Amino acid sequence: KFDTATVLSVHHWTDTLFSFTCTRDQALRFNNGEFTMVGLEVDGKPLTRAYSIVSPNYEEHLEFFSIKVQNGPLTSRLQHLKVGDPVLIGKKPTGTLVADNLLPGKTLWMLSTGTGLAPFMSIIRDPDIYERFDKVVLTHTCRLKGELAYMDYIKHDLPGHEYLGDVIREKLVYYPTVEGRITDLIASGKLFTDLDMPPFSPEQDRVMLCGSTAMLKDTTELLKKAGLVEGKNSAPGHYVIERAFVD
Numbered sequence: 001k002f003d004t005a006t007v008l009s010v011h012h013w014t015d016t017l018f019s020f021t022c023t024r025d026q027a028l029r030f031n032n033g034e035f036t037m038v039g040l041e042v043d044g045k046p047l048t049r050a051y052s053i054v055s056p057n058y059e060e061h062l063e064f065f066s067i068k069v070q071n072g073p074l075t076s077r078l079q080h081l082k083v084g085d086p087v088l089i090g091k092k093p094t095g096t097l098v099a100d101n102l103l104p105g106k107t108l109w110m111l112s113t114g115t116g117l118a119p120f121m122s123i124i125r126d127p128d129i130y131e132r133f134d135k136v137v138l139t140h141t142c143r144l145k146g147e148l149a150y151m152d153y154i155k156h157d158l159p160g161h162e163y164l165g166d167v168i169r170e171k172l173v174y175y176p177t178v179e180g181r182i183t184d185l186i187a188s189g190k191l192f193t194d195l196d197m198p199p200f201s202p203e204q205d206r207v208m209l210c211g212s213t214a215m216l217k218d219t220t221e222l223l224k225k226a227g228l229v230e231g232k233n234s235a236p237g238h239y240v241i242e243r244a245f246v247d
């Protein structure tokens, strides 16, 4: 069920965060925003975890962005990856952060906490996104030099799509929130006054959430009260959600 890929590059941005790129099987096809399984063979068995695919689907390699968890079975080992090392990559990506599950609208909001920024690193490089939205807002919890350096590097990695540089410049806004401070910024209305945007309505706003279970719970409650409905394959809506990690 796994491709054995070869690690092409490895980057340590901070003492808790690393990214890597690796070879991409021809069968690995996906929509920007989706996740797949990534792991290593440990004691003769696959040890794997869900990871958002950071790279856009037109990039010829894959990229992933990882936390280093202290006694984390996978990340305590994955952090030691070297160029040329093998890594297991799940052959079937999936996920709910899928724009086709959002009714047409004018503003796209991406509300992320922690490593939940990861799927949005792929989506903000999807040219289709700017063809269907007036403005894109990415909220995040990155505060450290190395975290911001990563997002800055990502936004310019645009193979075959250099023209998107000007589009991203014009249409994409990054809003620092620093981890469940976003819910409060919504409830108080300060998110919207800060950015000079109208409060959420299903008329206008499409929202993607990727963060903790707690952040998802509290924030969707506010979206539902504004009249927004969760989208799904069989019924596009106003918002979609995915956990950044499992409690």
Ligand SMILES: Cc1cc2nc3c(=O)[nH]c(=O)nc-3n(C[C@H](O)[C@H](O)[C@H](O)COP(=O)(O)OP(=O)(O)OC[C@H]3O[C@@H](n4cnc5c(N)ncnc54)[C@H](O)[C@@H]3O)c2cc1C
Residues within 6 Å of the ligand: 035, 049, 050, 051, 052, 053, 065, 066, 067, 069, 071, 072, 073, 074, 075, 076, 114, 115, 118, 119, 242, 243, 244, 245, 246, 247
């Ligand atoms: C759909 C999905 C997409 C994901 N995408 C990513 C990703 O792009 N990058 C990434 O680093 N992780 C991601 N995760 C979390 C990831 O799958 C692993 O749990 C993470 O790699 C840590 O694995 P581990 O074996 O070291 O620790 P685990 O044994 O998996 O967990 C150790 C503890 O750390 C907490 N934790 C785990 N991951 C994180 C995190 N990223 N941020 C904060 N706390 C965490 C968990 O609650 C867990 O209880 C994703 C999870 C899901 C469900």
